[PDB]
UniProtKB/TrEMBL annotation, chains A, B:
Keywords (A to Z) from UniProt: Metal-binding, Signal
CDD domains the UniProt entry points to: sialate_O-acetylesterase_like2
Gene Ontology molecular function: metal ion binding; phosphatidylcholine lysophospholipase activity
UniProt keyword annotation of Signal present: yes
Protein name listed in UniProt: Sialate O-acetylesterase
Gene source species: Phocaeicola vulgatus (strain ATCC 8482 / DSM 1447 / JCM 5826 / CCUG 4940 / NBRC 14291 / NCTC 11154) (Bacteroides vulgatus)
PANTHER family linked to this entry: SGNH HYDROLASE-TYPE ESTERASE DOMAIN-CONTAINING PROTEIN (PTHR30383:SF5), THIOESTERASE 1/PROTEASE 1/LYSOPHOSPHOLIPASE L1 (PTHR30383)
Domain of life assignment: Bacteria
Length: 201, 201
């Protein structure tokens, strides 16, 4: 029942994205529900910023829908993905392998697009929700420890969101940014805004 | 876990909307997941159109979050709400009563805002999903038969989306627009766009 809801919602969002043109001026935020949840053009006060987030999405789900994005040759793509693969038990190594597939596809199809790999955000089990995600809070840092070298190896930028969202004493997401331990409150998007607005300018 | 997920997601979206300014140039799409699911500014190619949809939302959930919208005195508000009240067993009469509360609040707080009441969309049980909604498909027309007179009585516009989405033979939503009987595929948002762009123009 729950997997059918993601699958149908993914098809809803993906088929809408196929109908919306991407141009060389565009700045794309690409990812899962943490990307889906924002009004990106309003947050940055920039009409060229576009939401390509899909709640529930995974690395290969992003990979499979790159074409209606990269064929428009967008100016920038900000990628945040992986935590739903964590909740499926997928290893950090395999997740990094699949992000590297996304990086190589974007570079091959739209070499002038500037690509930004955003650190997987921390999670927190304190609210007792999304246990498949939050019980694996330690995998976030395993991914990010591998994700930053991948960025420099592929010649793309790495944005460290994690270190601002995390509680350094616990390795988990600071509750001020979330009400379920996984997704962001408005205050969380303001922090994200302050970190990445220089890259969007 | 289902009600907690809506409740936390509502707080996520609502607290984000409290951080995003609304101005007198804005055109607001206000409603539940059928409103939430779209990229409205891209669909109409109009930077002034803004998404205030929240998946799972109900009439009083919309009412309770009017302040961060109407305080900016927006140019237009397009309201689509009620199907999640239907799925709770709420009568059409009670739903109309609550929509009329929303109308009066908007008219009181922002008298120059043009308000458009959109027909509740049909649903379809053919995919066997969201049975709390789809088993009550006959309630949609009961609401809409009362909603258009309310628009007249309150001096606001009524937009008949339902006629374009429904199968006249069955009273249910044409499957070409949906993959679950409730929410819209990209083709569904294109139909909505074609109906409503004149009002957004
Ligand atoms: Cl949960
Ligand atoms: Cl989970
Ligand atoms: Cl269902
Ligand atoms: Cl249901
Ligand atoms: Mg909190
Ligand atoms: Mg269909």
């Amino acid at each position: 029942n729950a997997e059918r809801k993601y699958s149908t919602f993914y098809e809803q969002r993906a088929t809408l994205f196929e109908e919306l043109p991407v141009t060389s001026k565009d700045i794309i935020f690409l990812g899962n529900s943490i990307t889906n949840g924002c009004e990106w053009a309003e947050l940055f006060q920039n009409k060229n910023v576009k939401n390509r987030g899909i709640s529930g999405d995974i690395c290969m789900g992003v990979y499979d829908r790159l074409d209606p994005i990269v064929k428009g040759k967008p100016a920038k793509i900000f990628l945040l993905i992986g935590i739903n693969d964590v909740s499926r038990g997928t290893s950090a190594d395999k997740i990094i392998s699949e992000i590297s597939m996304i990086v190589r596809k974007i570079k091959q199809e739209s070499p002038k697009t500037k690509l930004y790999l955003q650190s997987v955000l921390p999670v927190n089990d304190c609210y007792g929700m999304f246990n498949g995600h939050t019980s694996r809070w330690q995998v976030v840092k395993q991914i990010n420890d591998l994700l930053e070298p991948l960025a420099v190896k592929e010649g793309v930028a790495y944005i460290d969101l994690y270190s601002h969202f995390v509680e350094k004493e616990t390795g988990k997401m600071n509750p001020v940014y979330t009400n379920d331990g996984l997704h962001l409150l408005g205050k969380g998007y303001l922090l994200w805004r302050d970190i990445v607005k220089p890259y969007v300018d």
